[PDB]
Amino acid sequence: LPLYFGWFLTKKSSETLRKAGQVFLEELGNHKAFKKELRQFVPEKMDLVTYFGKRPPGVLHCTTKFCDYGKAPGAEEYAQQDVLKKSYSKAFTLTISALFVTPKTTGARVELSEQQLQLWPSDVDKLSPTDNLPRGSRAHITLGCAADVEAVQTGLDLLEILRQEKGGSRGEEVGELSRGKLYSLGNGRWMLTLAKNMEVRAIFTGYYG
């Protein structure tokens, strides 16, 4: 079994989203709202492209099931599904509706279709036992991580953002960047909601390390 399954972006789609991410970081770091919050981000204008120093080098992806070569619970069962066999090596179009920044990670929020959710595993959309976020809420594409941060944190950061909003504490609109509206979520967290959702082409496959 692979390390994980997921949707792996084409070269062109990866480059498009990477560039969108970079422009977001560049503009956010120069935005007055961000500058006001600098000590809530890093306890001196900060170059966020540099801050998020660990980045995917080329092909970007949206993970479905972490398998750990069969050691992750449910990996084998997931791999054996007819729907996976029918989807393997097939091209999909994923919708990105927002970009986000926290002190740990930056990435893209993916909003999966009903069909794509057939490939989404159980028990990944919770931060606590009693959480009731929509199926697929964790779906994301990592665009960068702070130096001491593991890439898995990107999904956890998105879940935290979505939990905050579901709980009734939504972001404050503080302005407009390229591609959409900027929201301050507090505690170093920022979200760009895209005026036009970005569509990326990607192949469902397994990654072996």
PDB file of N, CA, C and O in Angstrom, residues 52-79:
ATOM      1  N   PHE A  52       7.089  30.856   5.277  1.00  0.00           N
ATOM      2  CA  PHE A  52       6.586  29.525   4.946  1.00  0.00           C
ATOM      3  C   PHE A  52       7.616  28.783   4.093  1.00  0.00           C
ATOM      4  O   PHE A  52       7.364  28.408   2.940  1.00  0.00           O
ATOM      5  N   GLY A  53       8.770  28.554   4.712  1.00  0.00           N
ATOM      6  CA  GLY A  53       9.975  28.123   4.027  1.00  0.00           C
ATOM      7  C   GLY A  53       9.983  26.692   3.558  1.00  0.00           C
ATOM      8  O   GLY A  53      10.744  26.358   2.671  1.00  0.00           O
ATOM      9  N   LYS A  54       9.162  25.840   4.160  1.00  0.00           N
ATOM     10  CA  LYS A  54       9.014  24.473   3.694  1.00  0.00           C
ATOM     11  C   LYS A  54       7.805  24.432   2.772  1.00  0.00           C
ATOM     12  O   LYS A  54       6.671  24.566   3.222  1.00  0.00           O
ATOM     13  N   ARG A  55       8.053  24.284   1.479  1.00  0.00           N
ATOM     14  CA  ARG A  55       6.969  24.285   0.500  1.00  0.00           C
ATOM     15  C   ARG A  55       7.080  23.046  -0.382  1.00  0.00           C
ATOM     16  O   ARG A  55       8.171  22.496  -0.542  1.00  0.00           O
ATOM     17  N   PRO A  56       5.963  22.578  -0.931  1.00  0.00           N
ATOM     18  CA  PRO A  56       6.016  21.552  -1.981  1.00  0.00           C
ATOM     19  C   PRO A  56       6.876  22.066  -3.138  1.00  0.00           C
ATOM     20  O   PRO A  56       6.686  23.214  -3.542  1.00  0.00           O
ATOM     21  N   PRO A  57       7.854  21.294  -3.605  1.00  0.00           N
ATOM     22  CA  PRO A  57       8.737  21.745  -4.695  1.00  0.00           C
ATOM     23  C   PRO A  57       8.115  21.797  -6.109  1.00  0.00           C
ATOM     24  O   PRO A  57       8.566  22.605  -6.928  1.00  0.00           O
ATOM     25  N   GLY A  58       7.117  20.961  -6.392  1.00  0.00           N
ATOM     26  CA  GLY A  58       6.526  20.885  -7.722  1.00  0.00           C
ATOM     27  C   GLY A  58       5.056  20.512  -7.698  1.00  0.00           C
ATOM     28  O   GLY A  58       4.194  21.382  -7.587  1.00  0.00           O
ATOM     29  N   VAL A  59       4.751  19.223  -7.798  1.00  0.00           N
ATOM     30  CA  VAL A  59       3.361  18.774  -7.853  1.00  0.00           C
ATOM     31  C   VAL A  59       2.662  18.917  -6.494  1.00  0.00           C
ATOM     32  O   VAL A  59       3.152  18.438  -5.475  1.00  0.00           O
ATOM     33  N   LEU A  60       1.507  19.564  -6.495  1.00  0.00           N
ATOM     34  CA  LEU A  60       0.719  19.738  -5.277  1.00  0.00           C
ATOM     35  C   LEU A  60      -0.289  18.607  -5.189  1.00  0.00           C
ATOM     36  O   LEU A  60      -0.574  17.951  -6.190  1.00  0.00           O
ATOM     37  N   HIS A  61      -0.828  18.364  -3.998  1.00  0.00           N
ATOM     38  CA  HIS A  61      -1.830  17.311  -3.833  1.00  0.00           C
ATOM     39  C   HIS A  61      -2.862  17.604  -2.756  1.00  0.00           C
ATOM     40  O   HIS A  61      -2.652  18.434  -1.872  1.00  0.00           O
ATOM     41  N   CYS A  62      -3.963  16.870  -2.842  1.00  0.00           N
ATOM     42  CA  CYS A  62      -5.038  16.870  -1.860  1.00  0.00           C
ATOM     43  C   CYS A  62      -5.195  15.428  -1.392  1.00  0.00           C
ATOM     44  O   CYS A  62      -5.666  14.561  -2.137  1.00  0.00           O
ATOM     45  N   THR A  63      -4.707  15.155  -0.190  1.00  0.00           N
ATOM     46  CA  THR A  63      -4.727  13.812   0.369  1.00  0.00           C
ATOM     47  C   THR A  63      -6.150  13.376   0.681  1.00  0.00           C
ATOM     48  O   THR A  63      -6.946  14.180   1.152  1.00  0.00           O
ATOM     49  N   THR A  64      -6.462  12.106   0.424  1.00  0.00           N
ATOM     50  CA  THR A  64      -7.671  11.492   0.962  1.00  0.00           C
ATOM     51  C   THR A  64      -7.331  10.665   2.199  1.00  0.00           C
ATOM     52  O   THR A  64      -7.546  11.124   3.324  1.00  0.00           O
ATOM     53  N   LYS A  65      -6.787   9.472   1.994  1.00  0.00           N
ATOM     54  CA  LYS A  65      -6.547   8.527   3.088  1.00  0.00           C
ATOM     55  C   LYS A  65      -5.054   8.346   3.322  1.00  0.00           C
ATOM     56  O   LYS A  65      -4.331   7.917   2.431  1.00  0.00           O
ATOM     57  N   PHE A  66      -4.605   8.667   4.530  1.00  0.00           N
ATOM     58  CA  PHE A  66      -3.265   8.324   4.964  1.00  0.00           C
ATOM     59  C   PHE A  66      -3.201   6.835   5.284  1.00  0.00           C
ATOM     60  O   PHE A  66      -3.970   6.327   6.104  1.00  0.00           O
ATOM     61  N   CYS A  67      -2.294   6.129   4.618  1.00  0.00           N
ATOM     62  CA  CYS A  67      -2.248   4.671   4.704  1.00  0.00           C
ATOM     63  C   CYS A  67      -1.059   4.142   5.473  1.00  0.00           C
ATOM     64  O   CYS A  67      -1.157   3.074   6.058  1.00  0.00           O
ATOM     65  N   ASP A  68       0.063   4.863   5.445  1.00  0.00           N
ATOM     66  CA  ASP A  68       1.287   4.442   6.143  1.00  0.00           C
ATOM     67  C   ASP A  68       1.685   3.012   5.769  1.00  0.00           C
ATOM     68  O   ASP A  68       2.023   2.190   6.635  1.00  0.00           O
ATOM     69  N   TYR A  69       1.638   2.730   4.472  1.00  0.00           N
ATOM     70  CA  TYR A  69       1.970   1.414   3.915  1.00  0.00           C
ATOM     71  C   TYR A  69       1.174   0.248   4.521  1.00  0.00           C
ATOM     72  O   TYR A  69       1.659  -0.895   4.555  1.00  0.00           O
ATOM     73  N   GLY A  70      -0.054   0.528   4.966  1.00  0.00           N
ATOM     74  CA  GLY A  70      -0.927  -0.488   5.535  1.00  0.00           C
ATOM     75  C   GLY A  70      -1.055  -0.477   7.054  1.00  0.00           C
ATOM     76  O   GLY A  70      -1.905  -1.179   7.606  1.00  0.00           O
ATOM     77  N   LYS A  71      -0.234   0.324   7.719  1.00  0.00           N
ATOM     78  CA  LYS A  71      -0.205   0.410   9.182  1.00  0.00           C
ATOM     79  C   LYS A  71      -1.262   1.359   9.754  1.00  0.00           C
ATOM     80  O   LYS A  71      -1.639   1.238  10.923  1.00  0.00           O
ATOM     81  N   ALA A  72      -1.737   2.312   8.950  1.00  0.00           N
ATOM     82  CA  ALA A  72      -2.810   3.206   9.391  1.00  0.00           C
ATOM     83  C   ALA A  72      -4.131   2.448   9.393  1.00  0.00           C
ATOM     84  O   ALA A  72      -4.496   1.852   8.372  1.00  0.00           O
ATOM     85  N   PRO A  73      -4.845   2.429  10.523  1.00  0.00           N
ATOM     86  CA  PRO A  73      -6.126   1.708  10.591  1.00  0.00           C
ATOM     87  C   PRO A  73      -7.087   2.037   9.444  1.00  0.00           C
ATOM     88  O   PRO A  73      -7.336   3.216   9.159  1.00  0.00           O
ATOM     89  N   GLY A  74      -7.622   0.991   8.815  1.00  0.00           N
ATOM     90  CA  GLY A  74      -8.549   1.120   7.708  1.00  0.00           C
ATOM     91  C   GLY A  74      -7.907   1.322   6.345  1.00  0.00           C
ATOM     92  O   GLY A  74      -8.620   1.443   5.360  1.00  0.00           O
ATOM     93  N   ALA A  75      -6.576   1.325   6.275  1.00  0.00           N
ATOM     94  CA  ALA A  75      -5.880   1.570   5.014  1.00  0.00           C
ATOM     95  C   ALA A  75      -6.221   0.504   3.984  1.00  0.00           C
ATOM     96  O   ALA A  75      -6.604   0.824   2.866  1.00  0.00           O
ATOM     97  N   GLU A  76      -6.093  -0.761   4.370  1.00  0.00           N
ATOM     98  CA  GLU A  76      -6.373  -1.877   3.471  1.00  0.00           C
ATOM     99  C   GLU A  76      -7.818  -1.864   2.969  1.00  0.00           C
ATOM    100  O   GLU A  76      -8.065  -2.033   1.771  1.00  0.00           O
ATOM    101  N   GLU A  77      -8.761  -1.635   3.882  1.00  0.00           N
ATOM    102  CA  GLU A  77     -10.180  -1.559   3.533  1.00  0.00           C
ATOM    103  C   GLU A  77     -10.463  -0.443   2.530  1.00  0.00           C
ATOM    104  O   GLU A  77     -11.206  -0.628   1.566  1.00  0.00           O
ATOM    105  N   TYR A  78      -9.874   0.718   2.784  1.00  0.00           N
ATOM    106  CA  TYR A  78      -9.977   1.863   1.883  1.00  0.00           C
ATOM    107  C   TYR A  78      -9.446   1.506   0.490  1.00  0.00           C
ATOM    108  O   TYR A  78     -10.109   1.758  -0.514  1.00  0.00           O
ATOM    109  N   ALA A  79      -8.263   0.897   0.444  1.00  0.00           N
ATOM    110  CA  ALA A  79      -7.598   0.559  -0.815  1.00  0.00           C
ATOM    111  C   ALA A  79      -8.384  -0.433  -1.664  1.00  0.00           C
ATOM    112  O   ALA A  79      -8.253  -0.431  -2.889  1.00  0.00           O
TER     113      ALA A  79
END
